[PDB]
Amino acid sequence: YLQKPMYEVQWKVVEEINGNNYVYIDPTQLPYDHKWEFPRNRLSFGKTLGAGAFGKVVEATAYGLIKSDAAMTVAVKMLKPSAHLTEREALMSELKVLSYLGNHMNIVNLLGACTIGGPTLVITEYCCYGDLLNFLRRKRDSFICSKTSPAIMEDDELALDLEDLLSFSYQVAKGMAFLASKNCIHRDLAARNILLTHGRITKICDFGLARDIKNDSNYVVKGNARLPVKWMAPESIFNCVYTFESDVWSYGIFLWELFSLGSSPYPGMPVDSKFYKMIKEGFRMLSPEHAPAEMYDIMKTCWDADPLKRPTFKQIVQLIEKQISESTNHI
The missing domain is CATH 3.30.200.20 (Phosphorylase Kinase; domain 1)
Incomplete structure (x- = not known):
């Protein structure tokens, strides 16, 4: 009908x-x-x-x-x-x-x-290794103890380490810089929409067609639709606007997923009326245990309440390039 x-x-x-x-x-x-x-x-x-x-x-x-x-x-x-x-x-x-x-x-x-x-x-x-969220979760134990025998995913039986997380941060920033350079906004940036292929190359995508969104608790009911609220900027949640700057917010949430080895964000905090309230009042997640302070700094700026104070992806790329360079002979 x-x-x-x-x-x-x-x-x-x-x-x-x-x-x-x-x-x-x-x-x-x-x-x-x-x-x-x-x-x-x-x-x-x-x-x-x-x-x-x-x-x-x-x-x-x-x-x-x-x-x-x-x-x-x-x-x-x-x-x-x-x-x-x-x-x-x-x-x-x-x-x-x-x-x-x-x-x-x-x-x-x-x-x-x-x-x-x-x-x-x-x-x-x-992308033969599948989505990055699943990869992080399956490889998590190998990060926590290198002597443990890592989850075999296709031909990848290697552990996950800090250099991997740094590389993934950098690669995703580059891919998002590329999108923004074409005046493109992703609107659903998250570890579940980043895939991993040969050489542990990360590829940003939209994998929503392959997902039953009604059965994914990372999408929550708001205004007739199901939305990834924990990844969304306050201004998208409240004004329904998606921008370059709200993609940056999401990338900050992604960095949190990354360095938390694939934890769902705001763990144990349901998306309810007080969640919305504390986000707009300035509540932010604490650093992941395994995040370098410098990466958490990036996260915090990605989550600036003022969208215009957030870094662009071009700037994030430059910042992470400096971190990786400075992290040589320090991992």
């Missing part, structure tokens, strides 16, 4: 200085270069990586994607088989946004698409 909720593109591109303020570009207006088209008969689906309320992401092998004589593992985003054309247009819009952004080492990049002659599919890079 009526329309159920629809998948929407998570990342937004915004219009260049509304007036130190923000408005979204309708992604349908973005161009789509059909150079991305890949014949669907050259895709072989494997395991479902996750299924959410609107669709799923699956591992697949794409044959001749880049080199004619070479197969390649990819990830494929798709809606439910029953999805109508307007629902499927969201995936077209996602394709347009990824196309527009272009390629960076620290995002999950577009590799191709199947948008003709069948179900709409978006082919992206496959």
Whole structure:
């Protein structure tokens, strides 16, 4: 009888200085270069990586994607088989946004698409170690004791250490700097939306299509929707505005997840009316045990009540570059 909720593109591109303020570009207006088209008969689906309320992401092998004589593992985003054309247009819009952004080492990049002659599919890079949240949690024990035998995740049987966390901080800052440089806001930055691939390279993405948000307690009901309130800036929670500066707030929360070895933020504090209150009154999380003071300093600035006093990602990148440099022969 009526329309159920629809998948929407998570990342937004915004219009260049509304007036130190923000408005979204309708992604349908973005161009789509059909150079991305890949014949669907050259895709072989494997395991479902996750299924959410609107669709799923699956591992697949794409044959001749880049080199004619070479197969390649990819990830494929798709809606439910029953999805109508307007629902499927969201995936077209996602394709347009990824196309527009272009390629960076620290995002999950577009590799191709199947948008003709069948179900709409978006082919992206496959990240073999999965999401960073799960990685941190499974590798946690190896951080706490190096002699322990680390969780084997695909071909990665190495421990996690401080240098890993520093590298992840840096890489994610670089990927977010890249997004912001393209006037792109993520709006759901969190360890669950950062994936890990060969060389422990972190790639920022939106993995929400593979997630059942109703069964994820990190998303809470607020105003008809389910939102990652613990990652959100006070001004997003209260004014429903997402900005470059609220992405920075989220990155600060991500740094807390990182150095807490994948703890959920504000542990044991439900998102209720007093949570909202104490956030606006200036309550902030304490440092993670394993965070360098310098990294917690970054966190604290990411959480400045005044959005204009938060660092940009460009500045965070410069700050972490200085930390890593100064941390040599000190780890």
